[PDB]
Amino acid sequence: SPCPGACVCYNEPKVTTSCPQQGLQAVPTGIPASSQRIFLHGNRISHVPAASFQSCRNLTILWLHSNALARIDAAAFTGLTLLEQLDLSDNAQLHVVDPTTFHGLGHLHTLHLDRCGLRELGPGLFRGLAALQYLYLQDNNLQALPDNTFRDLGNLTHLFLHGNRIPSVPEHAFRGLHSLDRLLLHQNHVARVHPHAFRDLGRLMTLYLFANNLSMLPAEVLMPLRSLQYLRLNDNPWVCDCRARPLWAWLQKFRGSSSEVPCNLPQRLADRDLKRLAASDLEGCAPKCC
Ligand SMILES: *[C@@H]1O[C@H](CO)[C@@H](O)[C@H](O)[C@H]1NC(C)=O
Ligand SMILES: *[C@@H]1O[C@H](CO)[C@@H](O)[C@H](O)[C@H]1NC(C)=O
Ligand SMILES: *[C@@H]1O[C@H](CO)[C@@H](O)[C@H](O)[C@H]1NC(C)=O
Ligand SMILES: [Cl-]
């Protein structure tokens, strides 16, 4: 078992093939089949062809971040049934992941897809990832959150979606995420949230929605959040008239930690906080009650 190229090969704590920041233009040939950790980060790999690591049956960790990934083959990860961590982040020119790329990775615990320029989450992309706990999708180019996108992710605790261009939250965007603990949707273009979009998020404790385009929010959308303890809503154009009364009422009973809910309109209440207003301030109009 010769160590490929200028890689560093060692056995403890796990059999590791480390070849970082060597300017590699492709996955090196001859990676030992006993590899449990493969570090190919910081190079210049542009493609990941099919069965690139099929001999590493015991592969549990694979890092490909900070490369030049422009295309990943659909069968790139064939035979990696024991893969627990996959890192593809900091490849801002990836743009699109084939929807079959992650199939069969039933032991995957964490998946780093942040800063990959992702344009869309095609159907079936996260199918079958029943073990996944951490999913990093922030700092991409996402323009929609299709329904059932995380339907099989019953063990997901952390979903990072901030830093995209998501325009709204449909009803089934977060179906199945029963174990979800942290959900980060800030720094997007979220303008509306379906009243039942957070139906399965009864175990959620942190919800970040600041820096969006929310002008109102029906109190129904927060009602399923029985476990919530941190809520961010600042940097949104809140309308503080009759339409904000339900959100106002829910916030009066919230025992957790919440950010400012700054009023954008009317100018009389400019940058006042909704939770600190009186009910008499929320009368008249400036749909719904109007
Ligand atoms: C994976 O590990 C098992 C037991 O640790 C070993 O028998 C097997 O040969 C390994 N697979 C390789 C080296 O491809
Ligand atoms: C999901 O989590 C539960 C409890 O943490 C665990 O028993 C189960 O095996 C996990 N799912 C998978 C596919 O490992
Ligand atoms: C917010 O939504 C309004 C429509 O209600 C639209 O005119 C405006 O351009 C949006 N702003 C951003 C930053 O998305
Ligand atoms: Cl590690």
Alpha-carbon span 137 to 113, nearest angstrom: 5
Which ligand 3 atom minimizes the distance to the CA of 167? 14
Q: From ligand 1's centre to the CA of 92, what distance in Å?
A: 35
Beta bridge partners of 183: 159, 207
Return the biggest CA–CA distance within the chain: 77
Q: Which of 15, 16, 34 to mutate to test the pocket of ligand 1 (most atoms within 8 A of CB)?
A: 34
Q: Which of 155, 158, 179 to mutate to test the pocket of ligand 2 (most atoms within 8 A of CB)?
A: 155
Residue identifier of the C-alpha nearest atom 2 of ligand 1:
58
Q: Which of 54, 55, 57 to mutate to test the pocket of ligand 1 (most atoms within 8 A of CB)?
A: 57
Q: Please give the resolution of this entry in Å, rounded to 1 decimal.
A: 2.5
Asked if residues 117 and 143 have their Cβ atoms less than 8 Å apart, the reply is no
The residue whose two tokens read 């083959």 is 73
Q: From ligand 1's centre to the CA of 10, what distance in Å?
A: 15
Torsion of CA 105, 111, 114, 117, to 10 degrees: 0
Alpha-carbon span 187 to 66, nearest angstrom: 23
Alpha-carbon span 121 to 134, nearest angstrom: 16
Q: Are strands 8-10 and 16-18 parallel, antiparallel or unpaired?
A: antiparallel
* Contacts of range 102-107, beta carbons closer than 8 Å, 24 or more positions apart: 102/77, 102/126, 102/127, 102/128, 102/129, 103/127, 103/128, 104/77, 104/78, 104/80, 104/128, 105/77, 105/80, 105/81, 105/129, 106/81, 106/130, 106/131, 107/60, 107/81, 107/82, 107/83, 107/131
Could you tell me if the CB of 168 is within 6 A of ligand 1? no
Question: What stretches of the chain show up as alpha helix (H) in DSSP?
Answer: 245-253
Could you tell me if the CB of 289 is within 6 A of ligand 2? no
Asked if residues 66 and 45 have their Cβ atoms less than 8 Å apart, the reply is no
Could you tell me if the CB of 130 is within 6 A of ligand 2? yes
Alpha-carbon span 73 to 53, nearest angstrom: 12
Could you tell me if the CB of 131 is within 6 A of ligand 2? yes
Look at residues 165, 230, 219, 175 and name the one whose alpha carbon lies nearest to residue 197: 175
Q: From ligand 4's centre to the CA of 62, what distance in Å?
A: 10
Ligand at minimal distance from the CA of 165 is 3
Alpha-carbon span 28 to 19, nearest angstrom: 9
Residue 17 has which token pair?
Answer: 């093939």
Residue 267 has which token pair?
Answer: 């100018």
Which ligand 3 atom minimizes the distance to the CA of 237? 1
Give the chain's domains with CATH numbers: 1-290 (3.80.10.10)
